Nucleic acid binder design. Sequence first.
RNA 1: UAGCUAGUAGGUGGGGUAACGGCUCACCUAGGCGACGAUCCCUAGCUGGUCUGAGAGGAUGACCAGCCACACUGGAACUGA
RNA 2: CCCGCAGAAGAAGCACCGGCUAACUCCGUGCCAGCAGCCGCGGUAAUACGGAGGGUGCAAGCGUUAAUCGGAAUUACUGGGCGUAAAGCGCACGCAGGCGGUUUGUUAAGUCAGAUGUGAAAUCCCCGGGCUCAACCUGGGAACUGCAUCUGAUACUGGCAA
Lengths: 71, 80, 150, 123, 129, 205, 82
Amino acid sequence: AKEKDTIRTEGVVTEALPNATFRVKLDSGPEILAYISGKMRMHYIRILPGDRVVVEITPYDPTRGRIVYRK
Amino acid sequence: KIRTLQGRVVSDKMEKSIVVAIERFVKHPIYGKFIKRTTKLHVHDENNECGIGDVVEIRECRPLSKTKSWTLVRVVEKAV
Amino acid sequence: ELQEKLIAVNRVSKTVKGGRIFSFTALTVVGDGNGRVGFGYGKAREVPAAIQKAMEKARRNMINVALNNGTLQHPVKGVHTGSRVFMQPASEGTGIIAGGAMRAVLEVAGVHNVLAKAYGSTNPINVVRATIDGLENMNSPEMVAAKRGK
Amino acid sequence: ATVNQLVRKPRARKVAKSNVPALEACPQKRGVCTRVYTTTPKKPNSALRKVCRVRLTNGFEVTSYIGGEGHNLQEHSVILIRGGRVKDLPGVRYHTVRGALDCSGVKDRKQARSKYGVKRPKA
Amino acid sequence: SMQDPIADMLTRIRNGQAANKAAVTMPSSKLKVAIANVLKEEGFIEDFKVEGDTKPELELTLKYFQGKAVVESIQRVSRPGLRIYKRKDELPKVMAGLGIAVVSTSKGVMTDRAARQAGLGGEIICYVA
Amino acid sequence: ARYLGPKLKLSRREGTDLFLKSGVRAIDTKCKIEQAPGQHGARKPRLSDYGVQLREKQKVRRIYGVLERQFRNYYKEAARLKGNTGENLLALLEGRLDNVVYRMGFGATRAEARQLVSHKAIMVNGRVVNIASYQVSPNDVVSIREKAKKQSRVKAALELAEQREKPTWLEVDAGKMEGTFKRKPERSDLSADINEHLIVELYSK
Amino acid sequence: MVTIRLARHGAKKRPFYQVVVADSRNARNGRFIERVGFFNPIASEKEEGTRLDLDRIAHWVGQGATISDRVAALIKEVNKAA
RNA sequence: UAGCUAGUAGGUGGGGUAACGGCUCACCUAGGCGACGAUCCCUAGCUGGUCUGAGAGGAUGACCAGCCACACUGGAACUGA
RNA sequence: CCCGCAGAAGAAGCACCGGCUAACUCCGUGCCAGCAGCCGCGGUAAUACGGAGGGUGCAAGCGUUAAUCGGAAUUACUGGGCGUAAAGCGCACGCAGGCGGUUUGUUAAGUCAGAUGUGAAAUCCCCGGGCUCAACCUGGGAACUGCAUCUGAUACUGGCAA
């Protein structure tokens, strides 16, 4: 069963790539590739650069974020 | 009695030398067609008296030189 | 009374202005175990209604099939649409060795041992009727004696 | 086809290529690996799934799925590599064997221990 | 040009039986008569007849069980491009014996049943269903 | 080898008794027949065409107490023989040594019969025979030897043996702890429970 | 040269010999001219167990073949009568 | 992979081998093989068999047994049946 | 291999349970974690994930993976197709090759019949025998679908003649 070792922290969205993929600069961390979460796709929500989002990061691969929280 | 085959010359002629193509019939095992097989043999002769295109009886003997291990015996209707 | 059973049920949509609407299509086979083979294909808004309407149609459309010991008179082939069905009698012992859909239609006729295999399409609706055509044409020594010789 | 034509040129079977270049009539191979990513699948599903670039001992660079819950694997580590495609990810045709060579088993797993490399709990 | 008059004769039979005609004509020869004699022996056709001199013309009277044809089908099994020979052991049986084949043996034109009783084989021609 | 588990669960799963316990009394109270074992067995099964074949394989196998690999060997021998395969199958199973001991009634149960042949009580034609799978011949006398003679094990069995309907292919004897196997079982002699084409059908695919 | 000799094809710890005519150079299990009998030393209480066609063995002796010491003993055992 | 072959193809004579032989030499003639796939390349020890398959077929040649080839790499001869 | 002693004593695990496919509920996690052979499951009531209970299969093995054949009539001789779905050369004349109306004679090549030799043994198959039975071992027979030579048959095809 799932363990709670994933970390969530904020960042500004720098640039929107294809495929609902975003270049987000964290506050402490580097700029990481973040995909949007399922929930935003489910409730038909799209987002835009220059905005500040909570981004879940895994210790296994620190180059892949996950945009958890809303615009 | 000796065993023997019958074939036809269809070949050039050289000093004491003649070649004999022997046509035969074999069933082709995959598809069952009856297909004409061609067995070419170098042959020793009685002072090259045979023509070209006629039908010659033939039989086995000692090697008289490379691949020439057959010798002719009788010819039906020589040349044309 | 006769032996009845069903092969399969399949759901089908009409698809109309107000949206989808779902019928149910059944396929049924009956037989007396002494030939007298019959089949019925029926449909209904709900499931237990569909199999009853199929079994009602199964009473008529009834065809007489030759049978000896517990098997077919001779090797027969039959075709309907894309579905090619071959079979052979395989007299005594043996049991039934036969395809899906084929097994139900084959058994109610009253064979107890038999070899059969489905080539081509194996779609149930065309596997049926290919079978009935193969069973219907089938000859017998009595049938040949009627039209010629000994 | 016409029977004279089939005598002339016969029928020819398909090549029937394998799914794994690992091949060589081998179920298992070895490799030294380099990098462990967590890449997204194809859009019908979502997750971040654990994948590793295995340099095989026969000189082939290939990619391989990591099953089970977390792992110790990183950098230069010698793992065992079996077959099996994962279709939801791009081009992964292999799986690492958990509980072998340098790989940890899955700690605190209880069912299906034939996979995941876990000796039976005793109390 | 046609390359087998025997498959033509068998084709004229199954077309005639399907169309429900009585008399079927073709140019005569020996093996055409000898096959038609095997058909009348086993019982499938009503009668053969030949009429002519410069061009002899075989006239085959077909036969009907009811409104149904006596012959179920008939197919050319050995064919000009591909010859089939059956040995004494290997002689086939058409539809569990209910049908017959036509076989040309050293002792003439027989059925498979007659060729098993005769004890010799040869070129099978066609399967009479 | 052997099932080793709870006997009644197999009868309750199959839905007809397999006679595995059944010594002192054919008790209804313990069996709970047709109610199925476990939590969710109350519901109607609505079984498949594959499942009715697979169930009948287990139903026959669990009577004689065989495992699939040994049972497969009997099917291979029954197939190569001329005549019906299902009948030649049931003939080889009935021809087992542990089975004949149950038929003669020397043992109470098929498991106790297998225990007695394993424990070297049983002798056939004056050979002792360890192996349960052993194929009995026509014209075979069978008997208990002196060490196992007149113990509490055989003595209780011979009492409850009298209740049975009594086989038609063997001579019972048993006034002096022996028996004689006269001739082969045939389809009429053996029970009507088995569907014989059906069990053979499953191995065809 | 030709020798009459016993070759062992039987199972481990149960020898079943095949008396056989073969050349001396060939291995025991190897290449041979013909079989002529069998010899089971382990045997059973049944009558059969030593068998040898004497018209064959006397033929090969006539062609000059020599006899291995066990086969020589088994011939002088079975004789016309044992 | 469509043209390939000078001892190449054939004859006579000499020499050689246990013995037939362009086997090897001298001389003479101009052929030989080739789409029923020559030549070249890649790949491969072969078979009685094994495995699968309703059969036809397909795949395969561990073990057992028959035969050939090889014995650090490359080449040669002696002794001897 | 046989006898004796002691005492239930020393000896059961493994996969799977959404459909295909035999076998179900609850709890935890919440499109995350992860499962997945195939179609697919999971975004707050998961019979598909993780855990537990119950169940099913098989057994000193069980499962996964790799490798081969089968299913696959999916290279289709037996046993497939080519109007529109993959598939008839843009069209024509033609050599090599395939195939051939009808009558008689002849030959006996193909073909068909019989016999002899050969088709190693082991294997395979059948009927028997011996190891506690079986595996395994082994007696005899059949098999070894083949090929060569000889003697016959002449319907059909081929050769040859009119």
